[PDB]
Amino acid sequence: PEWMILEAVPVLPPDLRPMVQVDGGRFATSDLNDLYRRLINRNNRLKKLLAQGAPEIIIRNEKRMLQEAVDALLDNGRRGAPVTNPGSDRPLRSLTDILSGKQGRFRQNLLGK
Amino acid sequence: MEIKRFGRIREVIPLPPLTEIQVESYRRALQADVPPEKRENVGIQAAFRETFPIEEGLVLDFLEYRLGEPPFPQDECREKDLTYQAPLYARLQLIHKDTGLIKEDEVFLGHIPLMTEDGSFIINGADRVIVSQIHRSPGVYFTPDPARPGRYIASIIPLPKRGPWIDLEVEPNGVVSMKVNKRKFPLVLLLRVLGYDQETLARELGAYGELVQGLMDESVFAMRPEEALIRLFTLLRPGDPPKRDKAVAYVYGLIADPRRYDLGEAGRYKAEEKLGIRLSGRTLARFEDGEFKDEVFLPTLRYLFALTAGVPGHEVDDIDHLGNRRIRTVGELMTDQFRVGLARLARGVRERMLMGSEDSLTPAKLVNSRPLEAAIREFFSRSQLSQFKDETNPLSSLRHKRRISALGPGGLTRERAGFDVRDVHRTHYGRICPVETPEGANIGLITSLAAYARVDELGFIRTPYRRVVGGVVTDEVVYMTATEEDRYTIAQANTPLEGNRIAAERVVARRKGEPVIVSPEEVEFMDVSPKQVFSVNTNLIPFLEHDDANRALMGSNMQTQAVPLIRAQAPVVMTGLEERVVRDSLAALYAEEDGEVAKVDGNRIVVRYEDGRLVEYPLRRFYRSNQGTALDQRPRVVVGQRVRKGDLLADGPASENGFLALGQNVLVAIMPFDGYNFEDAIVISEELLKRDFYTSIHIERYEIEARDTKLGPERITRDIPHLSEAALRDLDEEGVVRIGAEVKPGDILVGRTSFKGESEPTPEERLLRSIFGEKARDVKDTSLRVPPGEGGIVVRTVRLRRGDPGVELKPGVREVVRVYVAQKRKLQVGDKLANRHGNKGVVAKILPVEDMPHLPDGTPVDVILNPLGVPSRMNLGQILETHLGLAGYFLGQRYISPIFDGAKEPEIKELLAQAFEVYFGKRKGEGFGVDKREVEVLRRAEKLGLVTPGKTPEEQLKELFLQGKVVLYDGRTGEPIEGPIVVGQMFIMKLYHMVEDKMHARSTGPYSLITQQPLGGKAQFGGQRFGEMEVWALEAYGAAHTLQEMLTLKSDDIEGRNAAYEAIIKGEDVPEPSVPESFRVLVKELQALALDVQTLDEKDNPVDIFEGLASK
DNA sequence: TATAATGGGAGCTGTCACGGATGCA
């Protein structure tokens, strides 16, 4: 049962969330990279706040933010507000969204192509 | 030719300016011609007044704004991919309250896009159109509660994103609730906060069925306004510390702040009219002398209780009534986005005001114009209502400018739109056309402004009527809203008049849309014209009254799709609207004053006016539209011509002497033809290609950039490796194809070289090099070639280089080259034709002329339409048109037949009689009798009851000709068609759906990044989608191997697709496939969710589909 | 690295029907 709780969070291979130069020299990238970056920034700041003996309010805030980072990575939008990129109302596209729906992996690329 | 016209209805007023909705909306929102002091508190001026002043202590106040002149004219913006815009300056002053210092400056806020003369925009070089939006008008509404019958919901709706919806409801427990931000609380509390006491509420609401007792709560009156206010703040903000100033700020911003809450001026007026009260501002309450004073809440509660009890003069509201739905035109939508940009700018202003060296703070040091610039740029580039302009033909642009959408920002989500919104409401009469809407998902959500309709200052659609006093029809016209219209008995526009007096004893009229037979004494108004019920497009359909609405819709819509033809003609049967459409769409050119024409040219017309001045009109010649159709103006006057004001100088695209010319007048035979016109297909004569009927000019734009790379620069060059002179024949010195060349698929248009990616040559490459002793060049061929199935004649090249005057490209690119390729498209098998009645079909066969059915005098028909398309579709109008066309063929005249007021059968029969004389008496004079085959057809017709027995051959042929039918000879045999056939002239258009643009095929090509499946779309050399349902089709056949091919060898089995291609080029059978790569992506994306997915064998032992490449 | 500064803004809305879990009387 405890496996429903994550200690190590897996990271998808980079080609499945590419960082590609489009024709003309600019860069296009998947949303998973910004979700993972949120996660890693908050996790690293948590490790530093622990190593530096911070009060309880602060560690509690960090841990809450870390749980929500993981939640946005896996099922963004499910609980609370959906994480968006700066200057846009569009929700970022998490792993659940990649799997499901009309445009999801199954219906879009596995049951028809 | 002669233009005979029918019709007995004189139209008092002409059609209004057809683009006035767009142009006037934007003019009102900008006020650019108004001197600043004289501006009204509307538009962007009202946005400025809302945002300013900015406080907290420093203050930044707004004096005025001004719009400068556009840096570049419209054509230059279209070329340079620039936006046609004006600089926006705002005069601001900073004041320190304590210091009294006042620093004043005019700061620059960026640019605002200007609207062109025809009501369109130019954003980044492409013409765009902002589509008006329809929505529920702000105000106070009363709707029935769908659960509890005898109960009603009071709804208080402000402007979109200008406050919260507020619902009042009488609960099952008797207390009156108030829902706001999804929070139900007893209204009594807010009534107390307003300063109301139980005495006043008791004397105001006691009359109603004891309902006022559900408003009576003792614990509420037990506290003063402050304690009730804090109670409400706690009920609305769980957890927020209930401070006093915090609660006052929240409640004020929620209910009385004109900068946060805003009914429209229309919402204001409608609340005033509904509740029978008067409003001071556009808010529900006010903050006066420290306390809150009510404006709207008590009137609304009074009306609600009165409707619940049932006292008369209270009715639930129809929310689809066009007196409760209003239009948000260009100006209002742009003003809203402007207001949002201004709010962000103000946030930044206060941010900079708090910090910073407060001794030296100018207006320039506080305003970051970027948020405002971004909001406007977003609205004009990526809004749902900012649409790529449809300029296929001029009517396309006109219709686009006059379209109304219920979708978009602040509107409805699709699939959240039931029958009600999409219905044609009774109040649509005269305001929104009932036929011009899309077929498919958007039906009833995209509509068109009726032809006589105007939108008033409040945003409601108004239609004109004539005053009728004592049975006399004045020429005083009154534009009404639907609310106003519902008060009157309005007669029909066709009611017979002698002079100005109603000459009929019984008169067909409307009362609240209901049709009623009424006496002339009861008639108060009368319709202006039948034209006022329909859109512009629908008003172009002759004999509309004989066409089922479902097909009128199609003909209406398809006129928008007509392609400008090099020999375009106006129809031989018109509705009388074909000239206004050319004029208002700014297609053609006209004379500005009376004058004599000095010069005439393929490129320019110079006119000497009565003032003695010389005015030169240049002509737009072979310009490329958004849809690639050619837009050239051709001169129609000659040197020395006398011209009065408003006389035609130049014909625009799809204009014939100032008449809207969307197609050709062809000679039609309505008969089957050996299956080649089966199921709406059409058969045409090669004589149409011979005389360049249905031929159109099309221009495509190709573009290429050379940019700086981390591996060296790209460069446009003629020096392209590994190419012969055969490949470089038509390339100029610099590498760009020469104007005039004929380019076919595969031809280079612009040479370009790119430095190769870092690569160690594979040992095979090294040995091949050694064998051939040739160094691999540093660069590679990346030239821009002609895509498959395209080409034509080069007509323009633009070249822009970094370091050249006036030129600055985006960071990185050294040079940009554009090539414009023209092509003359003849009609071909696959192209789409249609007439104005909804008859549409694809050319399926082009016969040589000697196979075409011909009249006895040797004249072959042009196209053969199949009669099986008529009865099921009930578009008999195209039949009557054909009949009239027949007469016009031999009389040599065209006709104007107003809709519902046009040519009837007897007058068409008179014309046909005259035509038959021209058609047959010619024969009798020239010395030929009736033909034997004509006798045989006459026998057949006599058995069909079409002619009377015992009349002469000529008399019977005249009888048939009066029925519109003639003898027709098969071109292949010379024997007659056993029956007489309906032959006549019909107006037929070539639509934008040409097969040249659609045919596509692919063996192998680009694949997608993650899925490794083929890209989609002709432009990407894409593969067809074999979707879920195609898979079901293959499954139901039991084509396991065909299906497995689709799923592996042809899509994303990498090894499989490679091995299949190799086997086929070698001549072997294709190998058995392997795992599709997207399933591996699924396995890894599940692993990314902490789910272990394991392919096993029958022994439950894992199988590695990754071939070890990801197991340590 | 040193005047003092000590709790936030944006909601935004014409379905719809079902299915299944929670909440009361």
Next chain:
DNA sequence: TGCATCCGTGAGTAAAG
């Protein structure tokens, strides 16, 4: 044992865009 009530979820295909 029974109802109201709330939350989550899904709502046609291909094309172009």
